[PDB]
């Protein structure tokens, strides 16, 4: 329930990583989503390569498996002057040992001591047993690979549901009973809208008939619903008496009455140019 | 000293083990099979060589090494030593010296 201005982020030229998957970073302001999740952290530099789908590594496997079908953007920037301290900043903890890799977006905060060997540890570190989390020497004199980097991941969720976050764009007027290019809540298409007597339950937004195309749709500004009919189409069939006999012609438009298109209306369509 | 990437007289002057090994090192004590009461000196070890060895390189040269500046010409003497020294394998020795 808040507008996302991705231009401020994308055009900032301060973030050291702009990795968008499934969505182009320049169209983040043009599409919109039902929800977006933000995860903000500080990670080393040789390791920001591990924050992306389908990768391996201690953070990629033992910290956060990102699924191969990600739709989101990975954003990171330097924090040498904001995170590091002279004496070493050890407030961020990381595990090197786990029993198995974490699930997609799985969070484990368990402080159990891992058994590297045969007999149990019983909550004490030690001989084939280590406390899971180790500290990092974030220092302002460290090399780039070991410097701290602040990472934010933005997973945009795109389902067939109301969109609560939408980018910077201008909503226009509504016109009815005419062939338009329409965009309702991110649903783009072309057709003619008509008032509909259907009733929508308070959770119900869209409507379908037999196929993926949405028959009806709801209005965001006003609590109203209008159905959608495709703009008129038909085959133009041409009648002729033979150019040998004459150059006159007649045209037939299949399956329409003669409103949208010497006029003869037939059950096959409107006939134009031929007398009755 | 028998593992990839290590140093030592056996590691350097006897058999350099490359850092990219795919294999297993297996050993066991032979106090009751290799040692004799009077000392088993049938196993010889070099302590001096001109240079460290290549991986899996085998040298059986018996040339006397030149510790000084004068040449030895295959004869020991001042700053001239034979390559191989014998080992005092005895059943009363310590494990550091046990075979």
């Amino acid at each position, epitope marked *: 329930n808040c507008v996302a201005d991705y231009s401020v982020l994308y055009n900032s030229a301060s973030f050291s990583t702009f990795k968008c998957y499934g969505v182009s970073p320049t169209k983040l302001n043009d599409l919109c989503f039902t929800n977006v999740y933000a995860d903000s952290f500080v990670i080393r530099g040789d390791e920001v390569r591990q924050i992306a789908p389908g990768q391996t590594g201690k953070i990629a496997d033992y910290n956060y498996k990102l699924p191969d079908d990600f739709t989101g953007c990975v954003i990171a920037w330097n924090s040498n002057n904001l995170d590091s301290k002279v004496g070493g900043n050890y407030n961020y903890l990381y595990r090197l040992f786990r029993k198995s890799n974490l699930k997609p977006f799985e969070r484990d905060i368990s402080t159990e001591i891992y058994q590297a060997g045969s007999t*149990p540890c019983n909550g004490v570190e030690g001989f084939n047993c280590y406390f899971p989390l180790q500290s990092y020497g974030f220092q302002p004199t460290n090399g780039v690979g070991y410097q701290p980097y602040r990472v934010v991941v933005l997973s945009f969720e795109l389902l067939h549901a109301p969109a609560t976050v939408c980018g910077p764009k201008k909503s226009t007027n509504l016109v009815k009973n005419k062939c338009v290019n329409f965009n309702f809540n991110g649903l783009t298409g072309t057709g003619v809208l008509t008032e509909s007597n259907k009733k929508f339950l308070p959770f119900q937004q869209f409507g379908r008939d037999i196929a993926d195309t949405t028959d009806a749709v709801r209005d965001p500004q006003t609590l109203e619903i209008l159905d959608i009919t495709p703009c008129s189409f038909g085959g133009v069939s041409v009648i002729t008496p033979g150019t040998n006999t004459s150059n006159q012609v007649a045209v037939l438009y299949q399956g329409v009455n003669c409103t949208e298109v010497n006029v003869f209306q037939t059950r096959a369509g409107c006939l134009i140019g031929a007398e009755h | 000293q028998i593992a990839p990437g290590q140093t030592g007289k056996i590691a350097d002057y006897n058999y350099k083990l490359p850092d990219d090994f795919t294999g297993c090192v297996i050993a066991w004590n032979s106090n009751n099979l290799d040692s004799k009461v009077g000392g088993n000196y049938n196993y010889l070890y070099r302590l001096f060589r001109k240079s460290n060895l290549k991986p899996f390189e085998r040298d059986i040269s018996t040339e006397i090494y030149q510790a000084g500046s004068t040449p030895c010409n295959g004869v020991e003497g001042f700053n001239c030593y034979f390559p191989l020294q014998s080992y005092g394998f005895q059943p009363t020795n310590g494990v550091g010296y046990q075979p």
Partner: nanobody
Amino acid sequence: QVQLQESGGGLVQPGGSLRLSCAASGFTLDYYAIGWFRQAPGKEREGVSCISSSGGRTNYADSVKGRFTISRDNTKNTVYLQMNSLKPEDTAVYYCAAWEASRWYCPLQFSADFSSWGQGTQVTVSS
């Protein structure tokens, strides 16, 4: 840089108690089984007490059963050996050694090499 260091040696009265500790540096003592070994004057070096790597299995010499207790502090990378009811027969230079199991079977009863050795500490029982 792997080092094994014994500590706690000294001079005690027979019937008294003493505690030894073996600490490791440059490597985690944590993956290896540790056994404590002594060499009496004029005798060979014998295995007094051994304990498995992660500590679920132990072995004691029959001369010392019911008198010494081997325990190994897990978090601190140290192995201890508690001696009670010490006797003049226990006067020896005491070594701590670390190695991996030469065998299947959880027990550490048998003997083989000991990859790392300390310099040892002196335990003297005399009165």
